[PDB]
Amino acid sequence: MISLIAALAVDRVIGMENAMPWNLPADLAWFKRNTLDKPVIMGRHTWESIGRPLPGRKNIILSSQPGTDDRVTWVKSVDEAIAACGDVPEIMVIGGGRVYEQFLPKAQKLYLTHIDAEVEGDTHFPDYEPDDWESVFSEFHDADAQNSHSYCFEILERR
Ligand SMILES: NC(=O)c1ccc[n+]([C@@H]2O[C@H](COP(=O)([O-])OP(=O)(O)OC[C@H]3O[C@@H](n4cnc5c(N)ncnc54)[C@H](OP(=O)(O)O)[C@@H]3O)[C@@H](O)[C@H]2O)c1
Ligand SMILES: CN(Cc1cnc2nc(N)nc(N)c2n1)c1ccc(C(=O)N[C@@H](CCC(=O)O)C(=O)O)cc1
Incomplete structure (x- = not known):
């Protein structure tokens, strides 16, 4: 199967310039956790930011x-x-x-x-539709010394 992996702010906002408007060392972590050992498809721009x-x-x-x-x-x-x-x-x-x-x-x-x-x-972010997806996981974290904002992970399977 295929999977999307992203971090959304409010309004489904995924980024500004060729950047991310935030800094969440924790996401990165979760991100790496979820990708290690899998093929990652990306786009010329996302790639340019990775470097x-x-x-x-x-x-x-x-x-x-x-x-x-x-x-x-x-x-x-x-x-x-x-x-x-x-x-x-x-x-x-x-x-x-x-x-x-x-x-x-x-x-x-x-x-x-x-x-x-x-x-x-x-x-x-692409507008996904609720009816289709079944949230199968949530995890919360309050802001901290390093991650200046609070976030909440989630995993949804397409119903
Ligand atoms: N927030 C997150 O969770 C997350 C994850 C990834 C990225 N981002 C962000 O998203 C924003 C940038 O994304 P974007 O949509 O502007 O760019 P992107 O999707 O990363 O890059 C798009 C480029 O893909 C190439 N391309 C796309 N589809 C293609 C196809 N079918 N065949 C050939 N080439 C194809 C074109 O490149 P050329 O014409 O130059 O070859 C196109 O300009 C950023 O600020 C970045 O930080 C966020
Ligand atoms: C700009 N960019 C794209 C990026 C960033 N965060 C995301 N966060 C999520 N959840 N999903 C994405 N697709 C996503 N994409 C990056 C930038 C750096 C690294 C990165 O450094 N990854 C290291 C993580 C540790 C570090 O940065 O030192 C890794 O080993 O996976 C990944 C993606």
């Missing part, structure tokens, strides 16, 4: 254009991308916007990080 391969996982990129790091596998098609994975039990789609939009419909599970902050952003 280096992600250890422990097969980094697949989506660029209409030419690969520019020999360390990571590039693609020019959703189908390619998906091919580029192989015989794996779960493929992680890590964003950004356009990419989400695109894979949402093929996904069957979501790992969300609901951030409790109201910030202006230029990229929102």
Whole structure:
């Protein structure tokens, strides 16, 4: 299966500039926890913000254009991308916007990080529909020294 993995602020806001309007060392952690050892599909921009391969996982990129790091596998098609994975039990789609939009419909599970902050952003998340999904997990955490805001993880299976 396919899976989306994202961290949303308020209003489904996923980011500003080619950035994230927050800093949650904890999400990153949960993120890595959920991806380690799985192929991660991403988009030219998300990749540009990462800036280096992600250890422990097969980094697949989506660029209409030419690969520019020999360390990571590039693609020019959703189908390619998906091919580029192989015989794996779960493929992680890590964003950004356009990419989400695109894979949402093929996904069957979501790992969300609901951030409790109201910030202006230029990229929102695909509108999923409640009826379809069954929340199978929640976990809460209050803000702290390091994670300046509160958040709540969640995992939903497509009903
Ligand atoms: N908040 C989170 O949970 C989370 C997770 C990931 C990313 N993000 C964020 O999301 C915002 C940026 O996302 P975005 O939507 O602007 O960019 P993106 O999805 O990361 O990058 C899009 C690029 O994908 C390439 N592309 C997409 N689909 C393609 C296809 N089918 N075939 C070929 N190329 C394809 C195009 O590249 P070219 O034309 O240049 O090749 C396109 O410009 C950020 O601020 C970032 O931090 C957030
Ligand atoms: C900009 N970006 C995209 C990003 C960030 N947080 C997200 N958070 C969630 N839940 N989902 C995403 N798709 C997501 N994507 C990043 C940036 C850094 C790292 C990163 O460093 N990952 C290390 C984590 C520890 C660290 O940053 O030192 C890893 O080993 O997985 C990952 C994604």
